[PDB]
Design a protein around this ligand. Sequence first.
Ligand code: MG
Ligand code: MG
Ligand code: MG
Ligand code: MG
Ligand code: MG
Ligand code: MG
Ligand code: MG
Ligand code: MG
Ligand code: MG
Ligand code: MG
Ligand code: MG
Ligand code: MG
Ligand code: MG
Ligand code: MG
Ligand code: MG
Lengths: 252, 68, 234, 117
Amino acid sequence: GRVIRGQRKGAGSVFRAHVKHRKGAARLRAVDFAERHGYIKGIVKDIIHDPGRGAPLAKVVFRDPYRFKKRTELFIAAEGIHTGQFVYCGKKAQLNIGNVLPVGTMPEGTIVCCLEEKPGDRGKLARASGNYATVISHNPETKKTRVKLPSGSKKVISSANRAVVGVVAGGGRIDKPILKAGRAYHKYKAKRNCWPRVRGVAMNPVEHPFGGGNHQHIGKPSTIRRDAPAGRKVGLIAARRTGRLRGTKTVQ
Amino acid sequence: GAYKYIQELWRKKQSDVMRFLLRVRCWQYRQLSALHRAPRPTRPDKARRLGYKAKQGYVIYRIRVRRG
Amino acid sequence: NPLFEKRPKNFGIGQDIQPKRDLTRFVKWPRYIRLQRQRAILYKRLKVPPAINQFTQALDRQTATQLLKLAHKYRPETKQEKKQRLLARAEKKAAGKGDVPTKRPPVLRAGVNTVTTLVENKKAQLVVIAHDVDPIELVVFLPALCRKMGVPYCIIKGKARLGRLVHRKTCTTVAFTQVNSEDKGALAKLVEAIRTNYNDRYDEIRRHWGGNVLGPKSVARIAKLEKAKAKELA
Amino acid sequence: KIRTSPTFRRPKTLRLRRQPKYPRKSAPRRNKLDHYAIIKFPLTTESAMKKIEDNNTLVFIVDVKANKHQIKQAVKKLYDIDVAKVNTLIRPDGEKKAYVRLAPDYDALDVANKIGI
RNA sequence: GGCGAGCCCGAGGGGCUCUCGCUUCUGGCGCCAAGCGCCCGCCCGGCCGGGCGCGACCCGCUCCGGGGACAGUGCCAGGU
RNA sequence: CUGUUUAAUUAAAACAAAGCAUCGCGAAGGCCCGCGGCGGGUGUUGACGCGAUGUGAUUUCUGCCCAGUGCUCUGAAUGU
RNA sequence: AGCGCCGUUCCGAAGGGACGGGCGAUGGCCUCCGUUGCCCUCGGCCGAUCGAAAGGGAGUCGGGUUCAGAUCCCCGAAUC
Ligand SMILES: [Mg+2]
Ligand SMILES: [Mg+2]
Ligand SMILES: [Mg+2]
Ligand SMILES: [Mg+2]
Ligand SMILES: [Mg+2]
Ligand SMILES: [Mg+2]
Ligand SMILES: [Mg+2]
Ligand SMILES: [Mg+2]
Ligand SMILES: [Mg+2]
Ligand SMILES: [Mg+2]
Ligand SMILES: [Mg+2]
Ligand SMILES: [Mg+2]
Ligand SMILES: [Mg+2]
Ligand SMILES: [Mg+2]
Ligand SMILES: [Mg+2]
């Protein structure tokens, strides 16, 4: 039959990111000599708003120790930082809110954000607004470090990758309800075309595996396995359980 | 005088003296481009029995295709 | 003395900028540069067969200089003096009506086919085998063949230097077959030294494997772990 | 030789100047668009005639491959008269219409009577 | 390398065993070298304009890290 | 609730909507496109995110059943 | 298999430019200047190129003129 809505995301025709008004990708400095054997001062000029992101962007200018030129980068603004605050980066940088330093230097229990999976990919984990990771379980031999992620998962990562100390500013963004369709339209128009949200039972049988019949009923079990083909995975995908929760996660 | 020795060394191409050179040449040719020019043949006996004569005009290309 | 002050600069982290250093091991080299460098490093890392580890085990430079001083006056003629000898011998035989003015011309033989034929027919007194042949399969049969036919062979480093004694880019093989009376003793001494070096130790080189050398960072890592193991034992 | 930069690029080689052994067409192609081929037809209509008295300006029909400089040079090399400015339009039949204003020292009526219009 | 610490022997000193360091109140500035030691054509033991090294340690065989005989790729076979 | 919908027979009690929830995914990943490449969309993105779903503001509520069909987890402990 | 397809910085030796100095040659009034060749030194392009007659984009306005032109043609007055 007809190609479902779930398969049309991969075409990239009208489902791309509305990426023109975004100011730039929020990464750290690439790793160099000064960020592994010392520290270097940088000056935050301002903080701005990246559209599609509720977290504020921070425009921190640096000084290049090799050729005389002031390099401008784009950090994720931590909570409580202000313009003119000297952001310090490197290995032996003193631990304050806004200073990025490798996780082997910081002690356990340090609440950080914008950390890295692999050492040297300029910040991947914990980048949404108001989220943080918990650093525990350092190891002298076999240089690893456990981090508690915002989903509750404990991931063992390397001990050389960097992380800015603090939480991401803009926390509590999901406290207010959207309260009408208009703010949802403007929010998703700012982010990307992800809002033709039509009910799969309400749509046609030839366009979705659930819809049709004289009554709006699903008819088939919505728990559909991970080994399903493309276009079959509708509803619950590989659901180990369903219904109301009991406990917190109960998953090791 | 030599090309029969080159052929007989090339025939049993599973032996330890040949498979090292074969692995080194496969790495060297895989890390090159897909279609390019080799300035001289690497199998002189096989090239000469296919028709290579060492004079101005005969050009050896090295080319890489994908199996399957 | 009037003003002439000193203005020192401190080149640490977080202060005045770094000077232009050598930057040799950190420049992004092109494709073929990286290919030849990691090709040499790949031959150094991986285990080579015992028929190609004979290369880099070659003759020392004093005996190679003696060999070049012997081979300098058995040089094959180039095109200019070849045509000169042809025209001069033709004019002398046309002037004198002579039959056989030349008794025996001494000249070495080059080329792998010619040298292989001469060692199979036992006409070669000495074999010079070049090192820098990039298909090694063209060369690998020659040492065992010279050993089983009893002709002494010497591995030498540099095929360009062996081509410049034959007036060509590559020569790859030099066969000493004919020697004069003033050179027979020197060639006998050279053949004695080469049979001492190569043919008497042919059963030694054929058994030994070459290569199997790790990189110096990993060697220093293993040495640091060995010093830590000695600290644990003591 | 110390390579301070971490990027290796092309050396400035010696690009050879082109010096061919033989010419490719044995002769220069002659100028088809010369002074007798640029300015083709003088226009003798009512408004183009009125421009001679009221404008001190001649009206010509020109091939479309010419410009103001070539029209000005063609007039100065054929009629030996000075040119103030040339206003060119494209007449919709396919030709160019050129209004050539002359110097105040010259007389457009006298030039028109000498050329025959 | 001591303007530094260390654990001991210990008279000066020894380095069994180890850490690198020369930027943390400030919305400033920082590049195209100062100095030193040599080498040249010039003014009788003077003056102009240049080149090298130290400043900026030496060597090495991967640009540096993270995986790594796994993942993937090609073919065959069984499920769905 | 405002909005949208069968242009050329329907304007709705239909669709959408904020809210309520559920499931998959920590990037060698989840959902997909592609005949092909470690090619692409999400991704200038990192669980307050992305993707797929049921219900449809607020108040009060979310009864009982895993027998069946699904989904998921586990032990080469054991049949095929 | 293939007309070709993917991709726009990814796996690229992807700048032919220029200040200053030195050496050589030529030309012009060899007074004094201008070119050409070589050497030293400098030089992120976010990568050729296209893409708006409503986006960005320096600078013209007044009067008169024909049956049909108008900030365009004539006069006068300005600017890049
Ligand atoms: Mg809530
Ligand atoms: Mg919804
Ligand atoms: Mg809906
Ligand atoms: Mg169906
Ligand atoms: Mg050739
Ligand atoms: Mg590696
Ligand atoms: Mg490992
Ligand atoms: Mg109706
Ligand atoms: Mg409700
Ligand atoms: Mg993914
Ligand atoms: Mg119920
Ligand atoms: Mg059960
Ligand atoms: Mg354009
Ligand atoms: Mg009009
Ligand atoms: Mg007007």
